[PDB]
Amino acid sequence: NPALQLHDWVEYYRPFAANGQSANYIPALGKVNDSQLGICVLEPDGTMIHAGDWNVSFTMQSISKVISFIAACMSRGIPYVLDRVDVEPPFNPMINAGALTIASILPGESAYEKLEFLYSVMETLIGKRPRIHEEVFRSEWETAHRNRALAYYLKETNFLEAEVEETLEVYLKQCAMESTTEDIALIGLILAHDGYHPIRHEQVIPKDVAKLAKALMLTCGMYNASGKYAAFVGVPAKSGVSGGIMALVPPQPFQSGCGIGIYGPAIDEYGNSLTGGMLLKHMAQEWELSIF
Amino acid sequence: NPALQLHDWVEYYRPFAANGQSAPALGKNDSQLGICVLEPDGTMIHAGDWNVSFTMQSISKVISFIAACMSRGIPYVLDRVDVEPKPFNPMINAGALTIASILPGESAYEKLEFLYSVMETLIGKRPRIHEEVFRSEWETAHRNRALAYYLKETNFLEAEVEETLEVYLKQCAMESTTEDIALIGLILAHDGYHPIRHEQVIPKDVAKLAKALMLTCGMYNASGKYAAFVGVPAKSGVSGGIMALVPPSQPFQSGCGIGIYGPAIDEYGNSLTGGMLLKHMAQEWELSIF
Numbered sequence: 102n103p104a105l106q107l108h109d110w111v112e113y114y115r116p117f118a119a120n121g122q123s124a125n126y127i128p129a130l131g132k133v134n135d136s137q138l139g140i141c142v143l144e145p146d147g148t149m150i151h152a153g154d155w156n157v158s159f160t161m162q163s164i165s166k167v168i169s170f171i172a173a174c175m176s177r178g179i180p181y182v183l184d185r186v187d188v189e190p191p192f193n194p195m196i197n198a199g200a201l202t203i204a205s206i207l208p209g210e211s212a213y214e215k216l217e218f219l220y221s222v223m224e225t226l227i228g229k230r231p232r233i234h235e236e237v238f239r240s241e242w243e244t245a246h247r248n249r250a251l252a253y254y255l256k257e258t259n260f261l262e263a264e265v266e267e268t269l270e271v272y273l274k275q276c277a278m279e280s281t282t283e284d285i286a287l288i289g290l291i292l293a294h295d296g297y298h299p300i301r302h303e304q305v306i307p308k309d310v311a312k313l314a315k316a317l318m319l320t321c322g323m324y325n326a327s328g329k330y331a332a333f334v335g336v337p338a339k340s341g342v343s344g345g346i347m348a349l350v351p352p353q354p355f356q357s358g359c360g361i362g363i364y365g366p367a368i369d370e371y372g373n374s375l376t377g378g379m380l381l382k383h384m385a386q387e388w389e390l391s392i393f
Numbered sequence: 394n395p396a397l398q399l400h401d402w403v404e405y406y407r408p409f410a411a412n413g414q415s416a417p418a419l420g421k422n423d424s425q426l427g428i429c430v431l432e433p434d435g436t437m438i439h440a441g442d443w444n445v446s447f448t449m450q451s452i453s454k455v456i457s458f459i460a461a462c463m464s465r466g467i468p469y470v471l472d473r474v475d476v477e478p479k480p481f482n483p484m485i486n487a488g489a490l491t492i493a494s495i496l497p498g499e500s501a502y503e504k505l506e507f508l509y510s511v512m513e514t515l516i517g518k519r520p521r522i523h524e525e526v527f528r529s530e531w532e533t534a535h536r537n538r539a540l541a542y543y544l545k546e547t548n549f550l551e552a553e554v555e556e557t558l559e560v561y562l563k564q565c566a567m568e569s570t571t572e573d574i575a576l577i578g579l580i581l582a583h584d585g586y587h588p589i590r591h592e593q594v595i596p597k598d599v600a601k602l603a604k605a606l607m608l609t610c611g612m613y614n615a616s617g618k619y620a621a622f623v624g625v626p627a628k629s630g631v632s633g634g635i636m637a638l639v640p641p642s643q644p645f646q647s648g649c650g651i652g653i654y655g656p657a658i659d660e661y662g663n664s665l666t667g668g669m670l671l672k673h674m675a676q677e678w679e680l681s682i683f
């Protein structure tokens with residue numbers, strides 16, 4: 102009975118949020134409640150189970166990287182994308198440097214138009230246009246030294262296809278798209294089904310793009326803990342420094358597969374939700390979710 | 394019809410060997426290509442140079458690592474070696490040498506006996522050391538000796554340098570054919586359960602740890618490219634071998650172990666023609682684990 106388990110596990114793991122804390126280098130993100138922990142799982146017949154702070158909005162942050170990657174592949178095609186970004190753990194698209202490159206190749210002659218495409222791909226997946234947290238965006242834009250450094254770096258080396266301020270606008274706004282555990286569990290369910298939207302009953306991401314997305318998640322989705330998660334959790338997963346984890350299991354419980362949206366704002370030293378990570382590992386182990 | 398398919402695909406991919414190169418004893422045929430696929434019910438399909446012997450080379454890092462976990466346990470091994478792409482990753486030379494050094498045994502002979510006893514549990518026999526290969530590695534192994542002393546310096550070797558190097562270069566020179574690697578693959582596919590012996594030969598959590606390493610770091614600097622275009626745990630050796638596996642999930646519904654051999658190596662250190670064949674099978678038979 103997964104629902105009861107998830108309630109107990111959220112109860113159990115919530116206290117460990119004392120071992121890390123919220124993000125600091127984006128100040129509007131340092132202001133969030135640190136004991137928060139929530140989870141949603143979505144099945145392809147539309148059954149969902151949630152527990153904890155499952156319905157608190159947060160910014161997607163690095164989660165948005167898999168969206169823009171997918172959006173860039175749908176727009177320019179895989180070959181175009183893989184010539185400018187690497188798939189090895191030219192920079193990796195899960196990393197800021199690769200993600201900045203990806204932002205700069207989104208179709209359009211301005212930031213606004215690069216972002217309209219992104220937003221419109223995102224509507225396709227979650228069924229609404231997403232809210233941009235301007236407060237979070239504003240504070241990142243003031244303080245984005247490292248990203249402007251990288252972006253000038255990429256531009257010097259011919260890896261950008263937009264101007265710096267433009268690319269940084271698109272990148273910092275995608276990071277500030279807001280989500281619930283619910284929206285990320287749906288994007289995760291869709292990826293589990295190879296770009297097939299199991300509620301809308303249509304193909305929303307091409308299957309090969311969705312395969313490339315899953316591989317990058319398993320391989321580089323959890324920053325510098327990716328091998329660890331692969332070894333002890335075994336589920337393709339993508340974290341964001343705001344404490345979100347998007348994970349998924351391909352088609353125990355959840356036989357037809359599932360999407361998972363987790364939120365736990367206290368993060369660890371690797372940059373991943375502390376309590377969200379603990380919970381995901383528990384589920385993976387208890388319900389034998391590992392895909393190898 | 395997987396068998397006729399495997400025949401046609403070996404025939405098709407064979408010539409591409411011309412784009413690659415064999416790795417000193419290792420440089421002495423370029424165009425060989427073999428494959429073996431084994432299922433839990435014991436049926437095996439094979440094609441090309443499927444029964445030609447070769448040295449395991451880096452494929453042995455997987456056995457070594459498994460063997461180190463079994464004796465010392467997972468916690469201890471992971472303090473000394475990293476799981477990511479300071480400790481080094483057991484799939485690269487530095488982490489493989491650390492692993493060799495923490496095998497149990499008061500000597501290089503003992504350590505190797507421990508490794509052969511685990512090897513024999515998997516494959517049903519004691520493996521042969523190609524001493525030609527071993528000895529011509531022994532003499533030209535400067536790079537490996539650099540690393541080993543480095544590791545000793547930084548307290549990440551738990552044995553003596555010459556002793557560690559002997560174990561390591563010896564596991565490298567262990568022999569197999571596509572067949573033995575297909576069997577190890579199957580067992581890994583089945584989480585350490587040996588489907589023909591019907592016993593648990595590797596603990597489950599060590600086998601998962603193994604597969605994760607393969608998926609993540611088994612193909613050197615093409616591991617991401619494999620995961621994204623093949624999507625099957627795979628481990629290469631510089632002598633042209635690839636061990637791959639498919640966990641139980643139209644064909645190979647129960648999973649399988651795959652052994653490939655193609656001595657023409659690409660820029661990345663992976664069998665050129667072996668990688669192409671594996672990609673074609675994964676793609677044609679929808680083997681990807683993602």
Ligand SMILES: *CC(=O)CC[C@H](N)C(=O)O
Pocket residue numbers: 161162163164197241248273276340341342343
């Ligand atoms: C990676 C992540 O979770 C947030 C990305 C953030 N905007 C950055 O530091 O680049």
Ligand SMILES: *CC(=O)CC[C@H](N)C(=O)O
Pocket residue numbers: 449450451452486537565629630631632
């Ligand atoms: C991985 C591989 O095939 C190289 C092993 C080789 N003997 C070495 O350099 O240690």
